Design a protein around this nucleic acid. Structure first.
Ligand SMILES: [Zn+2]
Ligand SMILES: [Zn+2]
Lengths: 100, 80, 43, 91, 92, 91, 80, 97, 92
DNA sequence: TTCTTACTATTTCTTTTTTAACTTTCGGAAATCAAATACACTAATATTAAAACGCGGGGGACAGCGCGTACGTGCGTTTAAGCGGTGCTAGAGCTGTCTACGACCAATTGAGCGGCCTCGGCA
DNA sequence: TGCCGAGGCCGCTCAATTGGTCGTAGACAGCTCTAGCACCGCTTAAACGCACGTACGCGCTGTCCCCCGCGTTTTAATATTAGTGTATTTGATTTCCGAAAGTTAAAAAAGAAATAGTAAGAA
């Protein structure tokens, strides 16, 4: 049985454990660490994807464009706080009008 | 006519419109040309270094992203 | 559980992957191989 | 001041490359030519610069805007840009 | 060749919004983002591993690194998801 | 304003720890106590905090000073501190 | 009387003197207490994490320097 | 090797030390020498700039305030050492009018 | 034990100012600074080495890394000092 | 004059080819148990520098008011972007192989380190 | 000026070095070919000067508010000593995953097996 089915996940732990050996991070890789990391990567990918789906749903659009990701990542904090220095390609700026 | 004046005052005004301003001076365009040129030297010096080290005589986008990583800035979408 | 040896069985002296400290040991209780561990330290 | 606020949000929706690409490309080729090699580029690397360039320029625009609004005026002078860059680290 | 995450990502997106479509450039965006977070966490884990004179990278060190790279309740809701799958994997 | 400039340079020479160390130590022990463990410290770690603390505080002081001088006044209000921290990243 | 008021107004005025100011408000002391407290939470959370991971029940200076390294700030003189 | 290149900094110590970091698969030959040369030059530069202030304040023992005068002056070095902190360092003497 | 650079540093300082004295805390300051620059350059060299699919770290890569970590003419006067000692070492 | 008829993609059945998974070996890492050892922290005073903390007072902040320079602002053009090919030759990939080069495994140390001391040079 | 420092002292133990293997690089050599850059040559949308006024930055004056004076208490301070009871670090010991061996499969392409159109030839 494959390790991802043996754990109940979708991102390939077989790729993850293979990259860490070729990543020269330390001498040995403890078994259990790559599936633990794969769980967090599988969590965050769907976490941002749900906010991107909600952004496409309020504009009645059946195709995710990078503006949706930009708006989602800038709207709520603790993700914008995490990605505090990134700029998405063709993303644009939040709608903001100040008291002039 | 060099290319630093290729950055037109309507383009600076247009980005200023996306910036969030309505009143600007005329001194602004020359000042922002100086600032932008300083930014470009401080990034393409690193990019040309990355291109020169790998003995490759052309610059690609991974070189750009790797150079921008030094500035404390990350650009997705093109690989990095 | 009888946490009393905490010591490897003879199968573990051949194949030291861990020791379960079971009857006769859970290291010995995978491959159906009681016979080596009743021919061992044997409490 | 007939048009100042109905258009400031018009291009906040139209996310595109705003700096026109050809003089940008010639500028970057000239300042690369100021370095030693006669060094060509991937075509994608021009846009890979251009989005980062516009991101930095929009960031400094917004920062000096908020500085000038604190300065109790609505106009930006280069005095505020020098402030905004000087407080932000680099110079 | 290209080491994309596209099949994995596209099968993830059907879990919540099974009708929404995706862009190839957008696919590249979050693929690069995933690689970024992976490099960040692995590099952080390596530094603390070489700090405490350890030669291996257990999930204890990953638990520390996810708790420091991810901020606040995003970390606290990634720790639980992280520690769930390892115990499901172990009891299999 | 009898004394404003002959003393502003007096303590620019006397490099010492300026924040008095005991209430600083009690504050850091209390806010460590707000985290779970009843966790003691190395004695040197208090000063190791304190120099970094004073460095950050002096940096923000100087930054909001230069902001307020741009604001065409000589007094600092918390409006300028909020500006200086907001333009600098964190919030 | 908690210890956040242990940071005396003369101490803030004294650091302000080393800061480079002569006129300040009285609102300044409470504002700067809030800012400084936010800074200390955002650093000693990382320091307590580094102390807790190594299964050591006391904090030393190398933990402090390692924690401050995350902020983008480096402190020499104590080891790091 | 330090005598074999005229260096005051230990080449072999560095060559052992970067191997103890898993920085890559293999370590080349001249690279630790190159590091030793760079570190020696940088130490020479900072000791020049420190000894200037050390003489100019009529002092013999170099104290870190005299060091922070040196760090905060060379614009390439101060640009390189922008985000640093030094205990008992002091401040740059600069005011307005 | 303590892995100081104190003997090396103290013998360097006699080259230019043979009368000036040093502080132990100041000794710790520039020793930590030396370790900082060493870690910065070595980490940068490692990243570009793993970028170009190379398994070894030659002095070519160090020449690139010193040219990017050090700014401007400080880099240009460290490259020459760097490339001098290797040729003196080779012809020995 | 559409009843047919073998093309004809086509589209789905079935298999090969591209990796990941299940066992042994075991070495060197890692956890454990116990002892030695360091040490961080309470607690007595003893100042004593230092924070409040007043009642002046002045100087800066701040608001209102002219004003006129100096910004937007259509209007009418000119000028290039830019799109659309051509196109041809430069570097990028991309294998074939191999001389050299570091990993490493032992000997062989001396040199860069604790630890006193003897001496008095810097604040 | 003195008192506590700061180099300058010796013993020494462990890393630096020296010398061979040898496994496997990356380094040239010779491709195939994009592909990028040069160029013409169209549009047509956008930059650019022009009068054009109102604002709004700015300077001036008045106000009045609040922030720093320095005497004067008043309260918490470093700074000592000692205990001292915890945590911490070694250190054998012991247990034990980690790598590495690969040989069941498997991934999705590949070819074929209908197969549902599919162009032509007479009522
Ligand atoms: Zn057993
Ligand atoms: Zn057994």
């Amino acid at each position: 049985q494959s390790r991802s089915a043996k754990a109940g996940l979708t991102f390939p732990v077989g790729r993850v454990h293979r990259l860490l050996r070729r990543g020269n991070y330390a001498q040995r890789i403890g078994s259990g660490a790559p599936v633990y990391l794969t769980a967090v990567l599988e969590y965050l990918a769907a976490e941002i994807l749900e906010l991107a789906g909600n952004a496409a749903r309020d504009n009645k659009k059946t195709r995710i464009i990078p503006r949706h990701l930009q708006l989602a990542i800038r709207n709520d904090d603790e993700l914008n706080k995490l990605l505090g220095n990134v700029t998405i390609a063709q993303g644009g700026v939040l709608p903001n009008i100040h008291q002039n | 006519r060099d290319n630093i004046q290729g950055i037109t005052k309507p383009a600076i005004r247009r980005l200023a419109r996306r910036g969030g301003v309505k009143r600007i001076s005329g001194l602004i365009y020359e000042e922002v040309r100086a600032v932008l040129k300083s930014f470009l030297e401080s990034v393409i010096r690193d990019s040309v270094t990355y291109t020169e080290h790998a003995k490759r005589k052309t610059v690609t986008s991974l070189d750009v992203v790797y150079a921008l990583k030094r500035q404390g800035r990350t650009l997705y979408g093109f690989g990095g | 559980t009888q946490l009393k040896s905490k010591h490897p069985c003879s199968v573990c002296t051949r194949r030291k992957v861990k020791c379960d400290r079971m009857i006769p040991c859970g290291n010995c209780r995978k491959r159906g191989q009681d016979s080596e561990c009743m021919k061992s330290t044997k409490l | 001041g007939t048009v100042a606020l109905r258009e400031i949000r018009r291009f906040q929706k139209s996310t595109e490359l705003l700096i026109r690409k050809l003089p940008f490309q010639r500028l970057v080729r000239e300042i690369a030519q100021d370095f030693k090699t006669d060094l060509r580029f991937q075509s994608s690397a021009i846009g890979a610069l251009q989005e980062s360039v516009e991101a930095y320029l929009v960031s400094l625009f917004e920062d000096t805007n908020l500085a000038a609004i604190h300065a109790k005026r609505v106009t930006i002078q280069k005095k505020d840009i020098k402030l905004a860059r000087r407080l932000r680290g680099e110079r | 060749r290209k080491e994309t995450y596209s099949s994995y990502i596209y099968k993830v997106l059907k879990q919540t919004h099974p009708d929404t479509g995706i862009s190839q450039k957008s696919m590249s965006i979050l693929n690069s983002f995933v690689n970024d977070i992976f490099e960040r966490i692995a590099t952080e884990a390596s530094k603390l591993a070489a700090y405490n004179k350890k030669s291996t990278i257990s999930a204890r060190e990953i638990q520390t690194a996810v708790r420091l790279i991810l901020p606040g309740e995003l970390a606290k809701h990634a720790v639980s998801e992280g520690t769930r799958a390892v115990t499901k994997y172990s009891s299999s």
